Design a protein around this motif. Structure first.
Motif, short mmCIF file in Angstrom:
data_model
loop_
_atom_site.label_atom_id
_atom_site.label_comp_id
_atom_site.label_asym_id
_atom_site.label_seq_id
_atom_site.Cartn_x
_atom_site.Cartn_y
_atom_site.Cartn_z
N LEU A 1 0.79 -1.22 0.00
CA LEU A 1 0.00 0.00 0.00
C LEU A 1 0.83 1.27 0.00
CD1 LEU A 1 -0.06 1.08 3.34
CD2 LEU A 1 -1.36 -1.05 3.43
N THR A 2 1.99 1.27 0.65
CA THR A 2 2.74 2.51 0.78
C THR A 2 3.46 2.89 -0.50
OG1 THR A 2 4.49 3.63 2.00
CG2 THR A 2 4.71 1.26 1.69
N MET A 3 3.63 1.96 -1.43
CA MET A 3 4.23 2.31 -2.71
C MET A 3 3.20 2.78 -3.72
SD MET A 3 7.28 -0.38 -3.52
CE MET A 3 6.21 -1.73 -3.02
N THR A 4 1.92 2.50 -3.48
CA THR A 4 0.86 2.94 -4.37
C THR A 4 0.02 4.04 -3.76
OG1 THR A 4 -1.07 2.22 -5.63
CG2 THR A 4 -0.64 1.13 -3.54
N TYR A 5 0.47 4.65 -2.66
CA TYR A 5 -0.30 5.71 -2.05
C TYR A 5 -0.32 6.96 -2.92
CZ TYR A 5 -1.66 9.59 0.80
OH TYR A 5 -2.29 10.72 1.27
N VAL A 6 0.84 7.36 -3.43
CA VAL A 6 0.87 8.50 -4.34
C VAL A 6 0.24 8.12 -5.68
CG1 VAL A 6 3.25 7.98 -5.06
CG2 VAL A 6 2.37 10.32 -5.27
N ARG A 7 0.32 6.84 -6.05
CA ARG A 7 -0.25 6.39 -7.31
C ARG A 7 -1.76 6.42 -7.27
NH1 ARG A 7 3.26 4.00 -10.81
NH2 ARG A 7 5.39 4.72 -10.37
N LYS A 8 -2.35 6.19 -6.10
CA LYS A 8 -3.79 6.34 -5.98
C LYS A 8 -4.18 7.78 -5.67
CE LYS A 8 -3.88 3.39 -2.81
NZ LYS A 8 -4.38 2.66 -1.61
N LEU A 9 -3.29 8.53 -5.03
CA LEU A 9 -3.61 9.89 -4.62
C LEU A 9 -3.63 10.85 -5.80
CD1 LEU A 9 -4.15 11.81 -2.29
CD2 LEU A 9 -1.69 12.12 -2.06
N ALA A 10 -2.74 10.66 -6.77
CA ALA A 10 -2.54 11.65 -7.83
C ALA A 10 -3.60 11.62 -8.91
CB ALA A 10 -1.16 11.46 -8.46
N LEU A 11 -4.70 10.89 -8.73
CA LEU A 11 -5.78 10.88 -9.71
C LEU A 11 -6.82 11.96 -9.42
CD1 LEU A 11 -6.12 8.85 -12.13
CD2 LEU A 11 -4.49 8.04 -10.43
N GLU A 12 -7.01 12.28 -8.15
CA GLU A 12 -8.07 13.16 -7.69
C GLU A 12 -7.56 14.38 -6.95
OE1 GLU A 12 -7.23 10.31 -6.42
OE2 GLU A 12 -6.96 10.63 -4.28
N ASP A 13 -6.30 14.39 -6.54
CA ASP A 13 -5.72 15.47 -5.77
C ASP A 13 -5.00 16.41 -6.72
OD1 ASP A 13 -3.47 16.89 -4.15
OD2 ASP A 13 -4.62 15.91 -2.56
N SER A 14 -4.96 17.68 -6.34
CA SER A 14 -4.23 18.68 -7.10
C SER A 14 -3.58 19.64 -6.12
CB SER A 14 -5.15 19.43 -8.07
OG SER A 14 -5.74 18.54 -9.00
N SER A 15 -2.25 19.64 -6.10
CA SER A 15 -1.50 20.49 -5.20
C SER A 15 -0.11 20.70 -5.79
CB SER A 15 -1.38 19.87 -3.81
OG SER A 15 -0.23 19.05 -3.73
N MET A 16 0.47 21.86 -5.48
CA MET A 16 1.81 22.17 -5.96
C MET A 16 2.85 21.22 -5.36
SD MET A 16 3.89 23.75 -7.82
CE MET A 16 3.05 25.10 -8.64
N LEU A 17 2.61 20.75 -4.14
CA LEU A 17 3.49 19.76 -3.53
C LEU A 17 3.44 18.44 -4.28
CD1 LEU A 17 5.22 18.55 -1.20
CD2 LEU A 17 3.08 18.25 0.03
N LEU A 18 2.23 17.96 -4.57
CA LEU A 18 2.09 16.68 -5.26
C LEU A 18 2.55 16.76 -6.71
CD1 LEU A 18 1.30 13.88 -4.63
CD2 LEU A 18 -1.05 14.38 -5.23
N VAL A 19 2.34 17.91 -7.36
CA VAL A 19 2.84 18.09 -8.71
C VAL A 19 4.36 18.15 -8.73
CG1 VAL A 19 2.95 19.78 -10.59
CG2 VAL A 19 0.75 19.07 -9.68
N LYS A 20 4.95 18.88 -7.78
CA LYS A 20 6.41 19.01 -7.74
C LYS A 20 7.08 17.70 -7.37
CE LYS A 20 9.85 21.85 -8.47
NZ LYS A 20 10.33 22.81 -7.44
N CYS A 21 6.41 16.83 -6.62
CA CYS A 21 7.02 15.55 -6.33
C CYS A 21 6.67 14.48 -7.36
CB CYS A 21 6.61 15.04 -4.95
SG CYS A 21 4.92 14.46 -4.87
N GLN A 22 5.68 14.72 -8.22
CA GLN A 22 5.32 13.68 -9.17
C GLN A 22 6.27 13.59 -10.35
OE1 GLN A 22 1.28 14.00 -10.43
NE2 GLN A 22 1.27 12.01 -11.47
N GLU A 23 6.83 14.73 -10.79
CA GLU A 23 7.60 14.76 -12.03
C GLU A 23 8.95 14.08 -11.92
OE1 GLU A 23 5.25 15.90 -13.89
OE2 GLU A 23 4.25 17.12 -12.38
#
Lengths: 142, 87
Positions: free
Chosen positions: A61-83
């Protein structure tokens, strides 16, 4: 230390100048000759072993937390860590928190084992400074 | 209806849409209800056939009771044996 393996020397000379300046708190500092030696080698060995073990230690679960989170969330933190990751409802596979306590505990041990490479020693806790910052009364002496 | 051509789940019963425990217990209850069905159909047919051979042998030995000879008493004495077991 870690970047300078198996790579060209012009990459090394382009990488020292990208990683010698530090703009911490209105001042620029430069490190005098970062040179790879056996001590940095054994530190690299400890670091890579700890992060390999925590990569093995990651649960389902902890390796897919951002993978499930980044479908519905929008934040500069999540965008800056996704790329800095690669590109490629649902169900959790099996919730077993009795295993997750042990996984998270040993993961905390591995994170501390990675952590103590850069957190060497607190030697003074500053309480109050002089206004011209020439001195400071501080505790934890010794 | 037929208890010899066992066809264990020609189509799949799995589904991602639920808990793995639910799919496991659904597979188990399918297998268990199948086993109970085949055994109850078997033993009901055995009970029916044992009841029929009991009725037929009793009716034959009572029908053979009237005539008396060597033949009639010999066949009566063969049909005096018990029938309640398979062997």
């Amino acid at each position: 230390g870690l970047f300078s393996l198996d790579r060209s020397y012009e990459e090394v000379k382009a990488a020292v100048q990208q990683l010698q300046t530090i703009t911490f708190r209105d001042a620029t500092f430069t490190i005098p000759d970062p040179v790879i030696d056996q001590h940095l080698l054994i530190d690299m060995k400890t670091a890579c072993l700890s992060m390999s073990m925590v990569a093995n230690l990651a649960s389902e679960l902890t390796m897919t937390y951002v993978r499930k989170l980044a479908l519905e969330d929008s934040s500069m933190l999540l965008v800056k860590c996704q790329e800095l990751l690669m590109r490629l409802p649902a169900r959790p596979q099996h919730v077993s928190p009795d295993d997750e306590i042990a996984r998270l505990s040993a993961l905390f041990v591995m994170l501390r084992q990675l952590d103590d490479l850069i957190r060497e020693q607190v030697v003074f806790t500053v309480c109050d400074v002089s206004p011209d910052n020439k001195s400071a009364t501080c505790i934890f002496k010794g | 209806r037929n208890m010899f051509c066992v066809k264990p789940l020609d189509l799949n019963l799995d589904r991602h849409a639920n808990t793995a425990l639910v799919n496991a217990v659904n597979k188990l209850v399918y297998t268990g209800r199948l086993i109970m069905n085949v055994r109850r159909s078997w033993e009901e047919l055995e009970r029916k056939c044992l009841a029929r051979i009991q009725e037929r042998c009793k009716l034959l030995v009572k029908e053979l009771r009237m005539c008396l000879s060597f033949d009639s008493n010999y066949c009566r004495n063969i049909l005096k044996h018990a029938v309640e077991n398979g062997d």
